Design a protein around this ligand. Structure first.
Ligand SMILES: *C(=O)/C=C/c1ccc(O)cc1
Length: 123
């Protein structure tokens, strides 16, 4: 088990494969520094209606999730990528190619130093 917002969430998830990530209680997306989707779990697809198997490789901010292209989400992502001190939490509404859905979001640098987690749960 691992809870949304856990202080060491990035440690726990670093040890996980696809199946384990698919079993999480919350949506989990891993992005590279450019916002390309590296991983996308089953729980996230349950929130958004995206097929996880097919969004891999797409750009989260340009193509998949344009409603997050804003200072409030994408702006915070780029600030944290640039600082090396991505770890930030906030509320948001997802409303592109889905019923508007209120969520809470947590972004955090992965240990694969290279990538960046985006965590989502319904509120
Ligand atoms: C806004 O358009 C948000 C879209 C979105 C958020 C999260 C996802 O996993 C997929 C699309």
């Amino acid at each position: 088990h691992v809870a949304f917002g856990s202080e060491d969430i990035e440690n726990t998830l670093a040890k996980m494969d696809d199946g384990q990530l698919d079993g999480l209680a919350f949506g989990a997306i891993q992005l590279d520094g450019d916002g390309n989707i590296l991983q996308y779990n089953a729980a996230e697809g349950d929130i958004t209606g995206r097929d996880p198997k097919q969004v891999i490789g797409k750009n989260f901010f340009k193509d998949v999730a344009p409603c997050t292209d804003s200072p409030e989400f994408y702006g915070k992502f780029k600030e944290g990528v640039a600082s090396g001190n991505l770890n930030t939490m906030f509320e948001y509404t997802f409303d592109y190619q889905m019923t508007p859905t209120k969520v809470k979001v947590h972004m955090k640098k992965a240990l694969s130093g290279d990538s960046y987690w985006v965590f989502v749960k319904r509120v």
